[PDB]
Write a protein that binds this ligand. Structure first.
Ligand code: BUF
Ligand code: UDP
Length: 423
């Protein structure tokens, strides 16, 4: 059985779908991963995973979409429709023939391409059910971007997904999030990268509307991009248990030079070891001599790391994160408590769930997040009794996540059900 997979062209969408693809390949499915030219330029390792990679034109890549998201997302959609159609037509000249297309839930219009080509369509949601619920209510018109929503904790305005941050892209971004539910009744399979025990009531409510399959964490060939694995893991192996602050703001968020200074000073004025992912295009905003000298005694500043392996390392005491869903889920499944510094979109909501529902992190308070506030949060997690509580809570969630992906677990059962439906 041949499965096609089409993530949105950004690492937080590619990676969870790649991990699901690796699970399905291990069950005997053939996988073809559809990437844009722009994504493929960053791909450095792919031989080992045995997945075919097929590229399509960019169609307009994230840096160009930011210049005008309303126009360029629509251009990206039109090219993706045309070019995935042409690619599927070519794949139909080869055995085994494609049978199903798993596509990012942010591109619901790919369902039409799947069905026009005689394929089953599976929408893959890369955000938890709790946050996806908000997008559904936005589409229904129940909410527009104190707030009560069914089966969610009471929210402050700042806990709703952040679209105002995008300024002239705000309305375009809000419409694309709500559009994820625009054809959900016509989808053949609805997949969520979450596990039931993490959000029992909202999953149960969602399941009362559509048959959904919770298949997360899809994370366990694990990386496509340069991760600097050797340098990162040898440095971590030099650290004692529970001593390293891991710091990352993900693949897209960028902090101003002013904000980077406060982070840098806060890490230095703490006396903790730290591994800080500062992407290559963001390095020039670090303080003058930070990467080359002042970070050398206690820090490793790196442009990308093997995040799953880092979070699994016993040296890591806590994760200062922007609260993207992959980073949130990977930390929870690793048992790593968090310092929440959300930037925009669903990160604000994830931070509220981390702090107040799952209780595995603390949130920073904006004044810019000043260095004293970051230092206080580090102290809360590394030293305080509250931090020991957050760690115990994280280990409890790690155990439930391990339950979910092991035989008899909810996510294992759902991946088996999806696989058997295809057979
Ligand atoms: C506007 C945006 C700001 C951050 C970066 O500079 C890139 C800009 C353009 C792209 C835009 C991001 C915002 C998050 C996305 C909607 C996010 C997304 C996409 C689909 C979806 O359903 O949910 C989130 C991925 C990246 C994103 O599409
Ligand atoms: O140094 C890094 C930083 C991040 N990641 C991965 O990049 C993704 C980040 O996704 P997330 O949802 O947390 O945030 P986004 O980048 O979409 O804002 C996740 O798969 C992380 O594991 C990584 O492999 N190495």
């Amino acid at each position: 059985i041949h499965i096609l997979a089409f993530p949105f062209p950004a690492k937080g969408h590619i990676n969870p779908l790649l991990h699901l693809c690796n699970r399905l390949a291990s069950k005997g499915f053939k996988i073809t991963l559809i990437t844009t030219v722009s994504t493929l330029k960053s791909v450095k390792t792919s031989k080992a995973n045995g997945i075919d990679i097929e590229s399509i034109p960019d169609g307009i890549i994230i840096t160009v979409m930011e210049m005008n998201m309303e126009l360029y997302f629509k251009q990206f959609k039109a090219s993706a429709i045309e070019n995935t159609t042409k690619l599927i037509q070519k794949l139909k000249t080869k055995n085994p023939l494609p049978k199903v297309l798993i596509y990012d839930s942010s591109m619901p219009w790919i369902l039409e391409v799947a069905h026009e080509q005689g394929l089953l369509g599976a929408s893959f949601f890369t955000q938890p059910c709790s946050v996806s619920a908000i997008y559904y209510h936005m589409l229904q018109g129940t909410i527009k971007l104190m707030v009560s929503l069914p089966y969610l904790p009471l929210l402050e305005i700042k806990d709703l997904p952040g679209v105002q941050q995008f300024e002239d892209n705000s309305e375009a971004v809000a419409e694309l999030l709500a559009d994820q539910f625009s054809n959900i009744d016509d989808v053949d399979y609805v997949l969520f990268n979450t596990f039931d025990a993490l959000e029992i009531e909202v999953v149960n409510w969602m399941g009362s509307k559509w048959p959904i399959l919770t298949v997360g964490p899809t994370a366990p060939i694990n990386y496509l991009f340069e991760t600097n694995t050797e340098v990162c893991m040898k440095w971590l192996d030099q650290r004692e248990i529970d001593t390293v602050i891991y710091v990352s703001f993900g693949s897209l968020a960028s902090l101003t030079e002013e904000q980077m200074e406060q982070v840098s000073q806060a890490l230095i004025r703490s006396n903790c070891y730290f591994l800080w992912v500062v992407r290559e295009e963001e390095e020039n905003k670090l303080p003058k001599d930070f990467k080359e000298t002042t970070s050398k005694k206690k820090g490793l500043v790196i442009n990308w790391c093997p995040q799953l392996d880092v979070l699994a390392h016993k040296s890591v005491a806590c994760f200062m994160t922007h609260c993207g869903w992959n980073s949130t889920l990977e930390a929870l499944c690793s048992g790593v408590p968090m310092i929440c510094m959300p930037q925009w979109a669903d990160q604000t909501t994830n931070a509220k769930l981390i702090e107040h529902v799952w209780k595995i992190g603390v949130g920073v308070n904006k004044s810019i997040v000043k260095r004293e506030e970051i230092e206080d949060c580090i102290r809360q997690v590394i030293e305080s009794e509250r931090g020991k509580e957050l760690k115990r809570n994280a280990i409890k969630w790690k155990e439930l996540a391990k339950e979910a992906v092991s035989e008899g677990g909810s996510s294992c059962n759902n991946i088996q059900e999806f696989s058997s439906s295809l057979l």
